[PDB]
Amino acid sequence: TENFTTNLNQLARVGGIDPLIGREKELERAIQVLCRRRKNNPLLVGESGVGKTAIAEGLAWRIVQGDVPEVMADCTIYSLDIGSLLAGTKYRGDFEKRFKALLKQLEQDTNSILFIDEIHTIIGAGAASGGQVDAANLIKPLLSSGKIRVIGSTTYQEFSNIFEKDRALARRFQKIDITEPSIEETVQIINGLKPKYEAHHDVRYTAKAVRAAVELAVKYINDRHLPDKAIDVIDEAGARARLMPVSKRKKTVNVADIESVVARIARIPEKSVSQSDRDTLKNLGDRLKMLVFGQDKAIEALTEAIKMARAGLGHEHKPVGSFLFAGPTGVGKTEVTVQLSKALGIELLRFDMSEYMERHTVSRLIGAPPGYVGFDQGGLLTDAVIKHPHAVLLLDEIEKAHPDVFNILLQVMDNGTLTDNNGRKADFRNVVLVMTTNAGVRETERKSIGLIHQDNSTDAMEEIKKIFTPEFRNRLDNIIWFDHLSTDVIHQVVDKFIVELQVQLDQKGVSLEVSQEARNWLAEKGYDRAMGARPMARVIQDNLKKPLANELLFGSLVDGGQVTVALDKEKNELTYGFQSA
């Protein structure tokens, strides 16, 4: 049976098993259970990555070192590979004969312990062809007698769904809970393991690098547990050195490299922003101001919030920024958000909230429809952010959506984490949240019944209070009220559409030239404060795009030629020169 089992004592004495630092309380309890007259079978139940197998294997390391009670000295721990027990047990009784042979060896010596990792796998392993004589049944009687000692290791999920179902087997095993360690005791673990990782990668770690790897991983890496969540960084940090040139910092790894690794694992922007990002960040306001005019206050809020986060002054657990964009039509509420994603080169998560008006549709954001038997038990909002943690989240026309959606965002803005029905948590700490609403648009469009016209901007705010609950509005960073487009910015808006037209025309091979007088004429005809910038596109479409379209298709522009537009003051009508070729 030497093939099926492995002697941890022998393996630990020569190569090493990644020694167990601390965990004195757990080992004392385990040894207490192992010294029991009967049912002396400890079970190390804990979350993944909490050192369940380091305690059982570490116990062997302590025995050879001698740091154990005299009762434990001279004991040999054997690890069971169930894959080898069931290797060639095709014929009836091969497994039972093979398995029982192993038990006789343990009972005969009476000073040997058996370690079964993933112990939940002995509940249905090679029992029979539609029979109930399983390995668990074969070990059960021996366990109660106390002739042999068996150490188990299994996750909470497996222990309850599988191991707990067999009440008889669970009775024999004494559940020893294992808890995730704290920050302080965790750094001691890495320090003790560090010599094994340093030699493997031929690197050295600083005192501050280890402290940072632990603290940073806890902050950003939320889908793992601390003992291993902090060793992935350490292990991955050393590997980076090997890939780099022999002359490029191979000897040691500093705190700067550690934060780089965490950023890649969590797909979040790394600290110590490069000068490249700074140039884009400083110019972020100016770049946005070249595509959206008259809304400098909104752009400042978005850019400043991003700067605070990168600088390190961002919210501890809240998102980068939560905003509500309320304003008249065509004022750039959605355009600024769409262009923000392009300026930052990050994914845009645009959710149209007019499709979530129904209450049942809100469960899709954080779950699946009731009674869905398939595999896609995920939420569109939770999975989107999980796939793109660093992104811009746009909830267009959120006021249309059911009030339940607001309640779903309370934890998104106050705590930064939204949990799916399955129980996985998403991170919104780097996702810029921008909401857009047209509340009070009718109030602004209508005119007050009075000698003096009234600014209905305040009426929209009162509507915002009625629609949104106070808790939801308090969490928001700020409620930006977009303002109507003035005649001055409209001239800039017309220039924006004209360049967009030129880009479309460039593919066709035709170049458009518009005189300044013509551009002003377009603005006056299409200017509508109430309707914003959208009428400007329509006037340009009716006046400029229409003549060009007929010519491009029906003649004088099939082949690329220059175009010139001018205004006739006498006729107060535009003119065009097609000038083919």
Binding site: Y91, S129, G130
Partner: peptide, 11 residues
């Protein structure tokens, strides 16, 4: 549906 099968040789 997937069930293991244990065989036996004739002799």
């Amino acid at each position: 549906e997937k069930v293991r099968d244990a065989l036996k040789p004739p002799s």
